[PDB]
Design a protein around this ligand. Structure first.
Ligand SMILES: *CC(=O)Nc1ccc(NC(=O)C*)cc1
Lengths: 15, 496, 86
């Protein structure tokens, strides 16, 4: 979830 | 005249009438004469000959330049016959029919209706495929006389393929009075939005803006007040490297009605096409738009498109990092946030927060956005827009959905929450109660950034205590199956 | 929503996790990566910001022995090359 949170936060630059 | 009231002599009699109808003081009694004009007209259509059809209509033009022969042709009904002679292969006829009709559309009421009734619209558009600029310029004028002040006619110009012809008239000829009349026609066919996709799809906008050097100031404006409307279809069109360079250069022209128009296109042209919003970044437009907002001030009609265009340029493409950096190297961050403060209306503020959200993508901009006093001004409007939505149940005022100010401000606070110092500001303003009160919002877009802004706050162990003391045990729990995937990802991230 | 086709190297990453198309809205690209790195357990349970893409296919697309997820722009550059541009 620590990887899940950061990677989902990477997808925030394209939204 | 008893002559006329008689296929070999009309070849003769229509000559001497052609002769008698050039001297203005000797053609007074040849138009105000009954049967003579009546006998003509019909021997023009029901004719196999050429010099008969030439010399027949050859006098109709000479009858038609005084307030007498124009009425004599109309009272004897020749205006629906002359549109049959608008498909004649004889180039003489088309220059003896169109030239005639153009006179009946100047000082003659009752012809504008009879020309659309006969069927001249679908005929005169089939004539705009010539090369004699005299014919093109006259006929295009006739189409601006029938289209102005009539909606039923603009659609007849549509189906007749009229839009694409006027585009290639621009794309080819260099004669102004042709290119101006064509621009006079192309606008009135673009003010109502049922006549617009078929113009750009024929490669329209990259042909209207094909006039960058032309000292005909009543023509460049007659091309820019068109593109400002047709912008709704360039959102998918491509191949405009020569128009953007034209437009981006005009963001500094001495007139304020071009800065309003050129910026009004770039916004509604970079809206979601990956290349054009990466093209103005390859021509150096990311700067010229900044020093356009610096030029406007309190003139919303300029800043709103100059912000929306700048909002479109600072997110979701490859060359977006320089778009986020070079907006501050040109001293924008002071003036950007100072648009949130009064008296800017909701349309600009909506675009203004959306820019700052994209502007906070770059790390180096985090502090100059903080130091210029942006974090309070966001929640200063995030609270007013939120507490307005509630007092309605548990809609567009001044053009904004109001609830977009909630997603826009919370989404801009979520990006700046990446910086640790900004979290002392976001929490130091007592907004943890408010962010939890947005997890209950029925809207999908508001729950994500709200569940995302807490996740950025929860990684501070101190700030995680308050959220659990807010009653946040069911909001970020019932959201664990959200079809909108992002809501559940952050909700479980806060939970853990 | 933005459509663009991945280069064949990356196209095998999304095929091998459950995709089959060629035109991806530039989200599924990240999405089926969010399952390619999460399923094979390529991170570090201590500090999961880091992705160990060493002896694996993922190291052939981004170069580099290792990287961090929080290096957003560095990984986005690694996208636009295994992706069709002009
Ligand atoms: C384990 C954990 O939840 N870490 C955490 C990681 C990343 C972020 N934020 C972003 O990646 C943007 C928050 C918390």
């Amino acid at each position: 979830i620590c990887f899940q949170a950061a990677w989902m936060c990477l997808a925030d630059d394209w939204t | 005249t008893k002559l006329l009231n008689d296929q070999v002599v009309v070849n003769k009699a229509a000559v001497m009438v052609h002769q008698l109808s050039k001297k203005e003081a000797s053609r007074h009694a040849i138009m105000r004469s009954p049967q003579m004009v009546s006998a003509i007209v019909r021997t023009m259509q029901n004719t196999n000959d050429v010099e008969t059809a030439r010399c027949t209509a050859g006098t109709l033009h000479n009858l038609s330049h005084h307030r007498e022969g124009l009425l004599a042709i109309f009272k004897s009904g020749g205006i629906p016959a002359l549109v049959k002679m608008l498909g004649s292969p004889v180039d003489s006829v088309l220059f003896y029919a169109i030239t005639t009709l153009h006179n009946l559309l100047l000082h003659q009421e009752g012809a504008k209706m009879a020309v659309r009734l006969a069927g001249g619209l679908q005929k005169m558009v089939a004539l705009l495929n010539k090369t004699n600029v005299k014919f093109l310029a006259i006929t295009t004028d006739c189409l601006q006389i029938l289209a102005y002040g009539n909606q039923e006619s603009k659609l007849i110009i549509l189906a007749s393929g009229g839009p694409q012809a006027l585009v290639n008239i621009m794309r080819t000829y260099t004669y102004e009075k042709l290119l101006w009349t064509t621009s006079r026609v192309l606008k009135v066919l673009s003010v109502c939005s049922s006549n617009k996709p078929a113009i750009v799809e024929a490669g329209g906008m990259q042909a209207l803006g094909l006039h960058l050097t032309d000292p005909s100031q009543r023509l460049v404006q007659n091309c820019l007040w068109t593109l400002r409307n047709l912008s709704d279809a360039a959102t998918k069109q491509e191949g405009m490297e020569g128009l953007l360079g034209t437009l981006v250069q005009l963001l500094g022209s001495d007139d304020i009605n071009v800065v309003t128009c050129a910026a009004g296109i770039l916004s509604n042209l970079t809206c979601n096409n990956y290349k054009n919003k990466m093209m103005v970044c390859q021509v150096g437009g990311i700067e010229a738009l900044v020093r356009t907002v610096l030029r406007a001030g309190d003139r919303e009609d300029i800043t709103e498109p100059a912000i929306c265009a700048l909002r479109h340029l600072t997110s979701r493409h490859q060359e977006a990092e320089m778009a986020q950096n070079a907006v501050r190297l040109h001293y924008g961050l002071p003036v950007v946030v100072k648009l949130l403060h009064p008296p800017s209306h909701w349309p600009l503020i909506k675009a203004t927060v959306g820019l700052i959200r994209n502007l906070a993508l770059c790390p180096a901009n985090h502090a100059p956005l903080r130091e210029q006093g942006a974090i309070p001004r966001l929640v200063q409007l995030l609270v007013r827009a939120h507490q307005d939505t509630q007092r309605r149940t548990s809609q567009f005022v001044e053009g904004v959905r109001m609830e977009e100010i909630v997603e826009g401000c919370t989404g801009a606070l979520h990006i700046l929450a990446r910086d640790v110092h900004n979290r002392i500001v976001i929490r130091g303003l007592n907004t943890i109660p408010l962010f939890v009160q947005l997890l209950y919002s029925p809207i999908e877009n508001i729950q994500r950034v709200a569940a995302g802004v807490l996740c950025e706050l929860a990684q501070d162990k101190e700030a995680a205590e308050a959220i659990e003391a807010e009653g946040a045990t069911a909001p970020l729990t019932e959201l664990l199956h959200s079809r909108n995937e992002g809501v559940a990802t952050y909700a479980a991230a806060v939970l853990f | 929503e933005t459509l663009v086709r991945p280069k064949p190297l990356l196209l095998k990453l999304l095929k091998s996790v459950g995709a089959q198309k060629d035109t991806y809205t530039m989200k599924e690209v990240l999405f089926y990566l969010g399952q390619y790195i999460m399923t094979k357990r390529l991170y570090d349970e201590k500090q999961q910001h880091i992705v160990y893409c060493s002896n694996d296919l993922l190291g052939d697309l981004f170069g580099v022995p290792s990287f961090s997820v929080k290096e957003h722009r560095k990984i986005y550059t690694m996208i636009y090359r295994n992706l069709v541009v002009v």
